[PDB]
Design an enzyme around this catalytic site. Structure first.
Site, PDB file in Angstrom:
ATOM      1  N   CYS A  76      45.188  44.819  29.079  1.00 33.59           N
ATOM      2  CA  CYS A  76      45.713  43.896  30.085  1.00 33.59           C
ATOM      3  C   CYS A  76      47.187  44.178  30.339  1.00 33.59           C
ATOM      4  O   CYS A  76      48.013  43.997  29.441  1.00 33.59           O
ATOM      5  CB  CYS A  76      45.562  42.440  29.650  1.00 33.59           C
ATOM      6  SG  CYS A  76      46.187  41.306  30.927  1.00 33.59           S
ATOM      7  N   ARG A 131      50.112  40.789  30.608  1.00 39.86           N
ATOM      8  CA  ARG A 131      50.323  39.928  29.447  1.00 39.86           C
ATOM      9  C   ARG A 131      51.726  39.335  29.326  1.00 39.86           C
ATOM     10  O   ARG A 131      51.919  38.471  28.460  1.00 39.86           O
ATOM     11  CB  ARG A 131      49.984  40.685  28.178  1.00 39.86           C
ATOM     12  CG  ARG A 131      48.486  40.814  27.948  1.00 39.86           C
ATOM     13  CD  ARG A 131      48.245  41.540  26.661  1.00 39.86           C
ATOM     14  NE  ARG A 131      48.383  42.996  26.797  1.00 39.86           N
ATOM     15  CZ  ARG A 131      48.510  43.832  25.772  1.00 39.86           C
ATOM     16  NH1 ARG A 131      48.548  43.342  24.520  1.00 39.86           N
ATOM     17  NH2 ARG A 131      48.610  45.147  25.989  1.00 39.86           N
ATOM     18  N   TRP A 189      45.627  36.704  38.396  1.00 42.08           N
ATOM     19  CA  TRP A 189      45.704  37.166  39.769  1.00 42.08           C
ATOM     20  C   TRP A 189      45.657  38.688  39.751  1.00 42.08           C
ATOM     21  O   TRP A 189      45.855  39.323  38.714  1.00 42.08           O
ATOM     22  CB  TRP A 189      46.953  36.646  40.483  1.00 42.08           C
ATOM     23  CG  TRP A 189      48.214  36.966  39.784  1.00 42.08           C
ATOM     24  CD1 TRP A 189      48.886  38.176  39.770  1.00 42.08           C
ATOM     25  CD2 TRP A 189      48.996  36.066  38.999  1.00 42.08           C
ATOM     26  NE1 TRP A 189      50.027  38.067  39.018  1.00 42.08           N
ATOM     27  CE2 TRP A 189      50.120  36.786  38.529  1.00 42.08           C
ATOM     28  CE3 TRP A 189      48.843  34.719  38.628  1.00 42.08           C
ATOM     29  CZ2 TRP A 189      51.090  36.209  37.714  1.00 42.08           C
ATOM     30  CZ3 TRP A 189      49.812  34.137  37.826  1.00 42.08           C
ATOM     31  CH2 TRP A 189      50.926  34.886  37.379  1.00 42.08           C
ATOM     32  N   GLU A 192      43.929  47.427  41.491  1.00 42.10           N
ATOM     33  CA  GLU A 192      42.539  47.114  41.148  1.00 42.10           C
ATOM     34  C   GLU A 192      41.679  47.092  42.404  1.00 42.10           C
ATOM     35  O   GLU A 192      40.595  47.681  42.455  1.00 42.10           O
ATOM     36  CB  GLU A 192      42.448  45.769  40.428  1.00 42.10           C
ATOM     37  CG  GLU A 192      43.126  45.684  39.098  1.00 42.10           C
ATOM     38  CD  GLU A 192      43.057  44.265  38.529  1.00 42.10           C
ATOM     39  OE1 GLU A 192      42.042  43.925  37.861  1.00 42.10           O
ATOM     40  OE2 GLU A 192      44.006  43.497  38.779  1.00 42.10           O
TER      41      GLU A 192
HETATM   42  C1  HEM Z   1      48.078  36.737  35.439  1.00 43.26           C
HETATM   43  C2  HEM Z   1      47.793  37.902  36.035  1.00 43.26           C
HETATM   44  C3  HEM Z   1      46.966  39.032  35.361  1.00 43.26           C
HETATM   45  C4  HEM Z   1      47.036  40.314  35.707  1.00 43.26           C
HETATM   46  C5  HEM Z   1      47.969  40.869  36.811  1.00 43.26           C
HETATM   47  C6  HEM Z   1      46.128  41.083  34.887  1.00 43.26           C
HETATM   48  C7  HEM Z   1      45.920  42.451  34.938  1.00 43.26           C
HETATM   49  C8  HEM Z   1      44.897  43.131  34.323  1.00 43.26           C
HETATM   50  C9  HEM Z   1      44.390  44.444  34.668  1.00 43.26           C
HETATM   51  C10 HEM Z   1      44.929  45.347  35.813  1.00 43.26           C
HETATM   52  C11 HEM Z   1      43.412  44.734  33.799  1.00 43.26           C
HETATM   53  C12 HEM Z   1      42.556  46.006  33.782  1.00 43.26           C
HETATM   54  C13 HEM Z   1      41.302  45.576  34.524  1.00 43.26           C
HETATM   55  C14 HEM Z   1      40.424  46.763  34.787  1.00 43.26           C
HETATM   56  O1  HEM Z   1      40.879  47.716  35.478  1.00 43.26           O
HETATM   57  O2  HEM Z   1      39.263  46.732  34.304  1.00 43.26           O
HETATM   58  C15 HEM Z   1      43.236  43.616  32.893  1.00 43.26           C
HETATM   59  C16 HEM Z   1      42.318  43.536  31.872  1.00 43.26           C
HETATM   60  C17 HEM Z   1      42.115  42.435  31.063  1.00 43.26           C
HETATM   61  N1  HEM Z   1      42.831  41.260  31.129  1.00 43.26           N
HETATM   62 FE1  HEM Z   1      44.410  40.790  32.334  1.00 43.26          FE
HETATM   63  N2  HEM Z   1      45.496  40.199  34.030  1.00 43.26           N
HETATM   64  C18 HEM Z   1      45.977  38.922  34.303  1.00 43.26           C
HETATM   65  C19 HEM Z   1      45.587  37.760  33.673  1.00 43.26           C
HETATM   66  C20 HEM Z   1      44.779  37.694  32.561  1.00 43.26           C
HETATM   67  C21 HEM Z   1      44.365  36.493  31.857  1.00 43.26           C
HETATM   68  C22 HEM Z   1      44.799  35.087  32.319  1.00 43.26           C
HETATM   69  C23 HEM Z   1      43.584  36.864  30.814  1.00 43.26           C
HETATM   70  C24 HEM Z   1      42.878  35.987  29.739  1.00 43.26           C
HETATM   71  C25 HEM Z   1      43.252  34.731  29.482  1.00 43.26           C
HETATM   72  C26 HEM Z   1      43.479  38.315  30.834  1.00 43.26           C
HETATM   73  C27 HEM Z   1      42.781  39.109  29.932  1.00 43.26           C
HETATM   74  C28 HEM Z   1      42.330  40.398  30.173  1.00 43.26           C
HETATM   75  C29 HEM Z   1      41.251  41.085  29.484  1.00 43.26           C
HETATM   76  C30 HEM Z   1      40.413  40.486  28.327  1.00 43.26           C
HETATM   77  C31 HEM Z   1      41.115  42.303  30.017  1.00 43.26           C
HETATM   78  C32 HEM Z   1      40.087  43.395  29.607  1.00 43.26           C
HETATM   79  C33 HEM Z   1      40.773  44.432  28.730  1.00 43.26           C
HETATM   80  C34 HEM Z   1      40.850  44.016  27.275  1.00 43.26           C
HETATM   81  O3  HEM Z   1      40.097  43.093  26.876  1.00 43.26           O
HETATM   82  O4  HEM Z   1      41.651  44.607  26.497  1.00 43.26           O
HETATM   83  N3  HEM Z   1      44.238  38.770  31.913  1.00 43.26           N
HETATM   84  N4  HEM Z   1      44.170  42.667  33.236  1.00 43.26           N
HETATM   85  C1  LIG Z   2      42.018  37.919  34.492  1.00 49.36           C
HETATM   86  C2  LIG Z   2      42.090  39.244  35.223  1.00 49.36           C
HETATM   87  C3  LIG Z   2      43.125  39.594  36.083  1.00 49.36           C
HETATM   88  C4  LIG Z   2      43.098  40.854  36.724  1.00 49.36           C
HETATM   89  N1  LIG Z   2      44.075  41.261  37.579  1.00 49.36           N
HETATM   90  N2  LIG Z   2      42.066  41.697  36.510  1.00 49.36           N
HETATM   91  C5  LIG Z   2      41.061  41.374  35.663  1.00 49.36           C
HETATM   92  C6  LIG Z   2      39.888  42.243  35.423  1.00 49.36           C
HETATM   93  C7  LIG Z   2      39.255  42.847  36.519  1.00 49.36           C
HETATM   94  C8  LIG Z   2      38.121  43.633  36.311  1.00 49.36           C
HETATM   95  C9  LIG Z   2      37.426  44.348  37.458  1.00 49.36           C
HETATM   96  N3  LIG Z   2      37.875  45.776  37.504  1.00 49.36           N
HETATM   97  C10 LIG Z   2      37.782  46.333  38.867  1.00 49.36           C
HETATM   98  C11 LIG Z   2      38.398  47.740  38.884  1.00 49.36           C
HETATM   99  C12 LIG Z   2      37.648  48.665  37.918  1.00 49.36           C
HETATM  100  F1  LIG Z   2      38.212  49.855  37.898  1.00 49.36           F
HETATM  101  F2  LIG Z   2      36.398  48.794  38.321  1.00 49.36           F
HETATM  102  C13 LIG Z   2      37.624  48.076  36.509  1.00 49.36           C
HETATM  103  C14 LIG Z   2      37.105  46.634  36.575  1.00 49.36           C
HETATM  104  C15 LIG Z   2      37.613  43.765  35.021  1.00 49.36           C
HETATM  105  C16 LIG Z   2      38.246  43.165  33.944  1.00 49.36           C
HETATM  106  F3  LIG Z   2      37.769  43.299  32.689  1.00 49.36           F
HETATM  107  C17 LIG Z   2      39.371  42.395  34.142  1.00 49.36           C
HETATM  108  F4  LIG Z   2      39.915  41.814  33.043  1.00 49.36           F
HETATM  109  C18 LIG Z   2      41.058  40.140  35.040  1.00 49.36           C
END
Ligand code: HEM
Ligand SMILES: Cc1cc(N)nc(-c2cc(CN3CCC(F)(F)CC3)cc(F)c2F)c1
Ligand code: HEM
Ligand SMILES: Cc1cc(N)nc(-c2cc(CN3CCC(F)(F)CC3)cc(F)c2F)c1
Ligand SMILES: C[C@H](O)[C@H](O)[C@H]1CNc2nc(N)[nH]c(=O)c2N1
Ligand SMILES: C[C@H](O)[C@H](O)[C@H]1CNc2nc(N)[nH]c(=O)c2N1
Ligand SMILES: [Cl-]
Ligand SMILES: [Cl-]
Ligand SMILES: [Gd+3]
Ligand SMILES: [Gd+3]
Ligand SMILES: [Gd+3]
Ligand SMILES: [Zn+2]
EC number: 1.14.13.39
Lengths: 401, 401
Positions: free
Chosen positions: B105, B108, B277, B282
């Site tokens: 993430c 964070r 958000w 993404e």
């Molecule tokens: C506030 C704005 C936030 C932004 C801009 C953001 C951004 C991102 C991005 C770009 C990813 C990679 C997603 C992907 O490409 O699959 C990600 C993954 C993730 N985010 Fe965040 N996120 C936000 C909020 C949150 C919140 C509120 C939570 C949980 C309370 C969260 C937990 C996670 C988790 C669990 C993942 C999957 C990767 C992992 O578990 O290590 N995010 N986030």
């Molecule tokens: C809370 C939160 C915020 C944020 N900006 N993003 C995620 C998130 C978005 C995906 C969808 N995302 C599409 C592109 C992709 F390349 F396909 C990889 C998957 C998956 C996740 F696990 C995520 F935490 C969650």
């Protein structure tokens, strides 16, 4: 025990059975991955046996007379001398294999096409310079670049090492200021300071090609001015941004790494410069746009009249793409071999498929294979990869000081 | 303790927090699997005990009366019941820590600002739906998005799990086609089939919002349509390419991941959707440009009059950058919170600094933190990272079907 590996664009699955042969254990543990880190007496016979076996399997000659014979000779040589000499063909085979095994090299589709100049009879910085000069002119080939390695004498105990002090054969100077900050390339401020030390007359420019500090065993390094006609450079212009040429940017034709240690069959060659041709992102993205390198990104953006006042204009991305266009266009105009990051990565995918069938996998370092711009636009982004050390190998080594 | 270098600045830190990493990752000294996407009362008690220790540290009450009393309360509950219940403030702390600990993430920096809806008293799929609608309404906030998590009842002996079958609360349908292609989002073909199989009358657009399949314990999933006015969407247009609006592209405001498992002190919440958000890449890079997603890259580049016949024109890089511009423009125009990859990675660097002081390190997955376009233009590219698993944690889990 055979990692499942998926390609997420196609959905195909392979198993890296080759990973089971990894010797020099990497930096990762079940508790923490360190994959993002750049830099993480007769055992010579184990590595020697292993490499000889590799050689003869490769030429379909395992378990057949010449195999046994060569096995005994290395045994006899080590017993009598504590080391051994590589056969010419083995030196060639080991050089290509070390390239093939380099996990961070995106260009390994070419691994079978490599010119090996055997410089193991070398003595003195004077001799090296003629070898390096032969290499450079062969590899450059008036812009029709040819991959080449020159292999200087292997390391022996008790006697000093052959070393090239420059990280590459072509490097641009980095001079400090009345304010610390650097003119030229900040990647080379140290070796620029070592050159100026050992007698070189510093220029004033941003693209002064540095001299070579060449080190024969147990002797002080000697400066060597490279023949200016032997350093093929490309002035940088852009196909439609007429002012881009006025920025005065240039890069050299030949990427020739001269600070890594080639290791074959237990033998160590701390002086073995290898070269190929550039992928355009190396120059256009890293060398020119890294904040700690030439850092030109904002200057180009100002020239493109871009909105540098907010990051969400993506002015950095726009300017970077045009700098990379200018690199590709300038090298093509100069007829200097270059490969863009789309063509390179597509060829690497082919290489992976080739290596799957030939060897059951391929050591690949995802973070280095995925290019530094448009990563997810290239197929290697969506390919899971297994990283591990096979031998023979190119290894990093301390600066000789 | 791993030494960790930032190559842009030259700074160096040691990740002491990684030594506390509980659960084990996929890498060994033989081989790194960092790039892979998807790598008992006594043991529940030791997890509970560590979390309670974490909680009382955060409230400056380590080793205190209430601390010891809470440990014995948990042991007594695990003895009498085989599980235990979190206090509301422990749940809130655990949910934030799970976010804080998510290594992939990049958002964070925000981890402390998280609205926790305690739905642990949820009784049915119908009440679950109401909770989800309220989550969506609160988090969307008419475009001024607020980070939230709704925590449904924990896994417990004797009962089935609450599950949201959808991978996110807002997903576009993916319809397998007459010719075998996909109309809509190919990532959602499976869940789309399940919705139809479960009584949903499909549409046939490219951006049909899916119904929710919601599972109460020991219950088949139950279909729920989202109220159309709860699902805020952003039509996509480009600030200077007016034909871009004619593509008819749209994306939704709220990224709400709904298929991950929340683990707090050994307790497992298989249903706990969280939302923040978007970062524009993404949507603009992955969702729209991935070959296996909406795959608009070539169509955009053709409309842009790029030379798509040669890779060295960088048509892909140019068209992707404008798709990302369009996303940013469109969300800013609609007044929907969004962050570009430059601002987001710049804030993640501050997060890493904050976390180095706070906990001696930060678990980070380099391949996921680095944006899929313009990687080395962002500061995170030049930052070595240490990837490891801390609890509380969001975990992947199998799909319930
Ligand atoms: C506030 C704005 C936030 C932004 C801009 C953001 C951004 C991102 C991005 C770009 C990813 C990679 C997603 C992907 O490409 O699959 C990600 C993954 C993730 N985010 Fe965040 N996120 C936000 C909020 C949150 C919140 C509120 C939570 C949980 C309370 C969260 C937990 C996670 C988790 C669990 C993942 C999957 C990767 C992992 O578990 O290590 N995010 N986030
Ligand atoms: C809370 C939160 C915020 C944020 N900006 N993003 C995620 C998130 C978005 C995906 C969808 N995302 C599409 C592109 C992709 F390349 F396909 C990889 C998957 C998956 C996740 F696990 C995520 F935490 C969650
Ligand atoms: C012919 C065209 C070639 C291309 C396009 C190419 C491309 C690349 C690139 C982009 C890197 C990333 C390194 C960086 O910039 O930090 C790299 C690394 C490397 N390359 Fe290649 N290369 C070529 C030829 C060769 C040859 C001929 C050799 C050796 C004989 C070689 C061996 C290596 C090694 C040792 C590394 C360091 C990474 C590692 O050891 O895993 N390459 N190459
Ligand atoms: C044979 C060969 C071909 C090729 N295209 N490139 C290299 C190479 C180039 C660097 C320089 N490179 C500058 C950018 C950077 F990002 F700063 C990282 C260092 C380093 C290496 F180890 C290399 F093998 C070698
Ligand atoms: C920290 C990170 O590992 C480091 O910046 C790496 C990332 N990937 C790279 N990839 C290539 N090709 N060259 C590099 O120098 C780097 N640098
Ligand atoms: C195979 C590879 O690990 C995979 O494509 C990863 C790479 N990095 C990523 N990074 C982010 N943020 N999101 C992703 O989906 C991925 N996918
Ligand atoms: Cl270079
Ligand atoms: Cl998404
Ligand atoms: Gd003007
Ligand atoms: Gd117009
Ligand atoms: Gd049309
Ligand atoms: Zn690893």
């Amino acid at each position: 025990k055979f990692p499942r590996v998926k390609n997420w664009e196609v959905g195909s699955i392979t198993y890296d059975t080759l990973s089971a042969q990894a010797q020099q254990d990497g930096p990762c543990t079940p508790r923490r991955c360190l994959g993002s880190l750049v830099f993480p007496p007769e055992q010579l016979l184990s590595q020697a046996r292993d490499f000889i076996n590799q050689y003869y399997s490769s030429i379909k000659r395992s378990g057949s007379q010449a195999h046994e014979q060569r096995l005994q000779e290395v045994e006899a040589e080590v017993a009598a001398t504590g080391t051994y000499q590589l056969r010419e063909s083995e030196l060639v085979f080991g050089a290509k294999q070390a390239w093939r095994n380099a996990p961070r090299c995106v260009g390994r589709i070419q691994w079978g096409k490599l010119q090996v100049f055997d410089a193991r009879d070398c003595r003195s910085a004077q001799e090296m310079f003629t070898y390096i000069c032969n290499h450079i002119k062969y590899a450059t080939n008036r812009g029709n670049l040819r991959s080449a390695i020159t292999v200087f004498p292997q390391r022996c105990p008790g006697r000093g090492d052959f070393r090239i002090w420059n990280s590459q054969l072509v490097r641009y100077a980095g001079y400090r200021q009345q304010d610390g900050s650097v003119r030229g390339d900040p990647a080379n401020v140290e070796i620029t300071e070592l050159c100026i030390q050992h007698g070189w007359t510093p220029g004033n420019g941003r693209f002064d090609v540095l001299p070579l500090l060449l080190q024969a065993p147990d002797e002080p390094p000697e400066l060597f001015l490279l023949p200016p006609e032997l350093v093929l450079e490309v002035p940088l212009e852009h196909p439609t941004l007429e002012w881009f040429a006025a920025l005065g940017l240039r890069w050299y034709a030949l990427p020739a790494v001269s600070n890594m240690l080639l290791e074959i069959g237990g033998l160590e060659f701390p002086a073995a410069p290898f070269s190929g041709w550039y992928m355009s992102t190396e120059i256009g993205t890293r060398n020119l746009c890294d904040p700690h390198r030439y850092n030109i990104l904002e200057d180009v953006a100002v020239c493109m009249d871009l909105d540098t006042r907010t990051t969400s204009s993506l002015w950095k991305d726009k300017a970077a793409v045009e700098i990379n266009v200018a690199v590709l266009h300038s090298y093509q105009l100069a007829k200097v071999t270059i490969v863009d990051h789309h063509a390179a990565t597509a060829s690497f995918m082919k290489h992976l498929e080739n290596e799957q069938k030939a060897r059951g996998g391929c050591p690949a370092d995802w973070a280095w294979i995925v290019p530094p711009i448009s990563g997810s636009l290239t197929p290697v982004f969506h390919q899971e990869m297994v990283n591990y050390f096979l031998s023979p190998a190119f290894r990093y080594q301390p600066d000789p000081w």
